[PDB]
Design a protein around this nucleic acid. Structure first.
Ligand code: SSA
Ligand code: SSA
Ligand code: PT
Ligand code: PT
Ligand code: PT
Ligand code: PT
Ligand code: PT
Ligand code: PT
Ligand code: PT
Ligand code: PT
Ligand code: PT
Ligand code: PT
Ligand code: PT
Ligand code: PT
Ligand code: PT
Ligand code: PT
Ligand code: PT
Ligand code: PT
Ligand code: PT
Ligand code: PT
Ligand code: PT
Ligand code: PT
Ligand code: PT
Ligand code: PT
Ligand code: PT
Ligand code: PT
Ligand code: PT
Ligand code: PT
Ligand code: ZN
Ligand code: ZN
Lengths: 527, 527
RNA sequence: GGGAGAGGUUGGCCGGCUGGUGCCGCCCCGGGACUUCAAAUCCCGUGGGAGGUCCCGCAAGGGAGCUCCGGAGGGUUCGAUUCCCUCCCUCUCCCGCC
RNA sequence: GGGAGAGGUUGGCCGGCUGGUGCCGCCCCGGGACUUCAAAUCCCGUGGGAGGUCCCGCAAGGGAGCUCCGGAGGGUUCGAUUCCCUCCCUCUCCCGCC
């Protein structure tokens, strides 16, 4: 892919000028610039920058400057500015007050067939033209900030990526085919065929909440949840010696950005905006509310105006605060490993659609284990964790498989292929549990993931600038257990009649709850 | 306050007309309308509507119609429309195609001195003029929807309220002076003077999280939190027989509206917007992200565009899902009372300011008790709950007071004075705990509220349309314990050295955690 | 089960009429006139539902008035109870099924 | 502690000069010329820091080149090492404090 730049540069002189007196100097400069300055740094076989033309108006000198990857037009402009202004200053007592790039054009010549639909959306350009297997990108009024931040450079990288069809996902990193079953519990005799959501709605173990994806869990359901969770903490989390933590469920949009998670699933998160400072805006709002007496376009639009820009996301990962914890810190193997868990609250995923599954919800509860160590140690914690969980699933008499996770959570986007970092051969494993009411065991939709076990390699260690004293390689990982999910699976397999639930569960129910609590019936509702 | 309406009404005839042929009919109608129709329903001593003038253009008949509270101009317009169109239809073969109110004016004559600053912001009017102790409100282009919804009526109510200076808060409902101490634990000998936030930051029992108002709680802190919470659940919640529930922490803006809570604290909540459906918007976004390589005005603004209108608030009350549960349901005393609690997760309050207190945070943990019963029973649950809590505070060897709560949470706004409903003499009580490091016990800022105990009267029962079979009066109430707060108070009083903590706490720490966990130190951080 | 026919109000699963904002008969209810009483006779209808507004009452509640409803929604028209379209529903017939 | 004075580089807490994009002397480093060797002598300076770009190398890393830095920030000017303002900091003096 040949790549060629052309810029319209404008040098604004300190005062008006009579060009005829100036040109002699510009001509001389330009000629010697093309010969020397704009060939400097260019490798022997290649082309640099040339000032292709110039002209002098009363305020300005206008230049056509062309470039190559070896020397780019604005870098050229930089080399020219300071110099041509010293000459102008010495010869004519005139400087260059400002320098601007009204038009900056880049042409990418392809061997591949290209058309608009191949390219797609091009983020920063004012024009995109595709012709003759060529992409002409034009940028108006280019800031020094764009240039410093290599914004155009990345646009180019993008357009290349978009044309080369790299977007087809077998192109992705994981070494082992997802779906691949590492481990299996053979089938248990099949004890319950009932539909957990429908049955739970029936008996009112959940009542549907007004918001999409959400539910109210009434006491029998909640008692199950409590002990199920407590039993998980006892058998796995606490047994493997993870120490407790309280992590924020409200996560700064910038933490999301550092993780690259924002790049990955921007459409699967909820966004959160806080209120503006000025208390009178809300005095006024309160007034609009009273007068309209409802939420409508007017009041709801007026609400938006009193809000700030979105600065947070309701936490989907559930492990984020941990990288903020280690951020910019330096570790010693005597301080390693670090193993924390958090069971504080609800974790959110926005899925659009019929939200009607109890097995897939927007608001869920999970135990998040999180850890950092040298990578041999790093991968063992995940192994132990898996073995730990397998044993629990057995104690809960559940049918389960462990398979290679289909996609990395923090990998769920692509062009991040831009960096370079050390990654595990198998980033993510899923602990799946069979739900009989969904179909025969062969069917992948009859299994839900009740937990994911991930080694991250160096990914977050890098973005959060976590280092080791020596400089040893550091790895992180997280595992988490959707307890909401484990509950559904327990019901799906063992059914709703409590005396047929697993032993450790009955005991927990009885001791803490004195029997399985009953639905808070009304006359109308439970039905 | 005398009140007088004048409307410019426009009746649009089905076809163009030659007025001279029409006027004879309009004149006749108008004269008889003023005599009969527009005096109907008006009480004997009072004024109705009059059509003060009319004129006929080629498409339209224009009318000046004036009114009083007894008969308002548009009601007049309604009485006129159907009738004048039957006559026009019979005499001229012409109907009234549409009817509009381009200008609708209301004048409120006051005896009180009024100026603009008294009135303040007037929500729906296109003009407000104050002169000669008079407020002229003008509405352009008035929809039938405004009229149906009595929007203007409430504007008037408002402007009256705003002038009558009712806004000064001694005007508020609570019978007993807030601050009033119902009950007290005499001073304990004073065992620790240290500053809990500063000390905790020092030893790294919390690390500061990037977002305003938030923190990471590391294992010793979290272990304390876990057992403290578990001990509360054992001694109060579970002892008084509250049954467990899982309540949504993400609350629909409409639930907020029904509670009247939105009217109350619109500036103390976080707002949440979900993403738009179209997945390509995010394809595009992902692209803008890569190219800019940062969150900035451009990308952050572009993010806003892919978001929907705010439809939720991060739950500040912590009891909201319960009214959604009972909503539109009918209860039987055999089903009463209903007592649930929820310990699911974080509850949010946006306070703007230096967020540096551990005693006042944006993201906190509390146990929420919630209940419904006949009101004698209703108030007992709160009493029991208080007695329950007092005993716990004693077992935790804390200095505590119970005082009349300064403001109702769901009362935190005003003009809701519009309705009529049965309210307790003392809506809210606070359980306050002494923090030595803040000042001498006399100082109210040295006490924080570790819980609030509220009977709501009929307030939510009404707005959520919860009824009883018989029709007996129903009450609700909630209590909640900020466990975050209880932790700070424990430290504030007993200090950071674990062997000097209360007995039931040590035991809980040892059994579950095998000693008090240690800080996950790095080389740099804990410091 | 498939098909065709008849119908559907605002006291009446009453009958009839009507492109003029609904009318006629009969009955029921309520009220009124006539009057020894009774019955007979005659007049009135703001007779059901739904939602606002205003007045009265501490309250339970009472009164005034207005708009909308003709199975439900939509069309035509100046005007639809009336004509046309869609669905709903009752009632009889044919066909097939035992 | 208060006050006043002197100063502050991009090899040198070296000295001097300079409104022309920095220069002079001396020393140090590196490189080069002259040459029996040594020393002497002469020339060169892209000699420190910071950040991009390009090339090379599997890599550790190597090379080319460009922009910015004269205590830190800002002003004037066509041009600031030089002049002016603000803060920082070193060095001496006076005053007061023992
Ligand atoms: N929508 C959902 N409904 C219920 N549980 C869910 C949902 N999304 C995630 N979970 C639970 O959370 C676990 C982790 O989700 S994950 O995307 O696969 N992996 C992660 O988030 C990792 N960061 C570990 O927390 C799942 O295995 C499941 O147990
Ligand atoms: N910003 C905060 N930081 C810490 N705890 C808080 C905060 N806001 C509220 N709480 C806790 O939550 C309790 C209840 O808050 S409240 O406004 O007073 N009352 C309510 O919210 C009631 N609906 C009961 O939940 C407080 O007493 C305190 O224990
Ligand atoms: Pt090339
Ligand atoms: Pt020159
Ligand atoms: Pt071009
Ligand atoms: Pt520039
Ligand atoms: Pt560039
Ligand atoms: Pt640049
Ligand atoms: Pt891809
Ligand atoms: Pt079943
Ligand atoms: Pt309201
Ligand atoms: Pt390794
Ligand atoms: Pt238990
Ligand atoms: Pt009922
Ligand atoms: Pt009046
Ligand atoms: Pt007429
Ligand atoms: Pt007026
Ligand atoms: Pt209208
Ligand atoms: Pt009105
Ligand atoms: Pt209306
Ligand atoms: Pt008020
Ligand atoms: Pt102290
Ligand atoms: Pt990126
Ligand atoms: Pt009562
Ligand atoms: Pt325990
Ligand atoms: Pt260190
Ligand atoms: Pt009205
Ligand atoms: Pt460059
Ligand atoms: Zn995670
Ligand atoms: Zn509450």
């Amino acid at each position: 892919m040949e790549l060629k730049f052309s810029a319209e540069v404008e040098l604004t002189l300190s005062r008006e000028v009579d060009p005829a007196e100036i040109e002699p100097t510009v001509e001389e400069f330009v000629k010697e610039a093309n010969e020397d300055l704009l060939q400097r740094g260019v490798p022997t076989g290649k082309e640099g920058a040339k000032i292709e033309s110039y002209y002098v108006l009363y305020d300005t000198i206008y230049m056509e400057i062309t470039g190559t990857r070896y020397l780019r037009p604005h870098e050229a402009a930089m080399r020219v500015r300071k110099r041509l202004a010293e000459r102008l200053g010495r010869k004519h007592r005139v400087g260059v007050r400002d320098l601007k790039i009204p038009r900056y054009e880049v042409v990418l010549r392809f061997d591949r067939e290209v058309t608009y639909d191949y390219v797609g959306y091009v983020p920063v350009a004012d024009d995109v033209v595709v012709e003759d297997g060529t992409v002409r990108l034009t940028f108006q009024d280019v800031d020094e900030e764009m240039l410093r931040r290599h914004v155009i450079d990345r646009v180019i990288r993008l357009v290349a990526w978009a044309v080369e069809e790299r977007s087809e996902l077998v192109e992705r990193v994981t070494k082992v085919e997802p779906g691949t079953v590492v481990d299996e519990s053979g089938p248990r005799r099949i004890r319950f065929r009932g539909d957990v959501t429908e049955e739970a709605r029936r008996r009112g173990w959940v009542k549907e909440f007004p918001g999409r994806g959400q539910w109210i869990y009434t006491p029998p359901m909640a008692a199950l949840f409590e002990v199920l969770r407590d039993f998980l903490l006892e058998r796995v989390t606490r047994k493997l010696g993870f120490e407790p933590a309280l992590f924020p469920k409200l996560i700064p949009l910038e933490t999301m950005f550092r993780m690259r998670y924002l790049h990955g699933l921007p459409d699967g998160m909820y966004y959160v905006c806080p209120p503006k400072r000025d208390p009178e805006l809300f005095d006024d709002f309160k007034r609009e509310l009273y007068v309209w007496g409802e939420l409508n376009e007017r009041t709801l639009g007026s609400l938006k105006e009193k809000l700030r820009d979105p600065g947070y996301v309701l936490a989907p990962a559930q492990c984020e605060p941990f990288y903020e914890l280690l951020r910019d810190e330096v570790v010693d193997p005597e301080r390693l490993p670090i193993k924390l868990y958090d069971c504080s609250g609800w974790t959110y995923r926005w899925e659009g659609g019929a939200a009607k599954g109890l097995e897939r919800v927007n608001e869920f509860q999970r135990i998040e284990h999180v850890w950092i160590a040298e990578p041999e140690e790093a991968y063992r914690i995940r192994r132990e964790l898996l073995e730990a969980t397998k044993r629990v699933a057995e104690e809960l008499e559940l049918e389960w498989k462990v398979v290679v996770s289909d996609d990395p959570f923090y990998l769920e986007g692509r062009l991040l292929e831009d960096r370079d970092i050390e990654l595990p051969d198998v980033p993510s494993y899923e602990f799946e549990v069979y739900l009989p009411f969904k179909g025969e065991r062969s069917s992948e939709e009859a299994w839900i993931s009740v937990g994911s076990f991930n080694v991250h390699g160096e990914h977050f260690v890098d973005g959060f600038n976590v280092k080791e004293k020596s400089g040893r390689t550091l790895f992180t990982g997280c595992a988490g257990l959707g307890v909401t999910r484990w509950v559904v699976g327990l019901l799906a397999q063992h059914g709703f009649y409590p005396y047929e639930w697993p032993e450790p569960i009955l005991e927990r129910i009885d001791e803490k709850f004195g029997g399985l609590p009953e639905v808070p019936k009304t006359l109308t509702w439970p039905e």
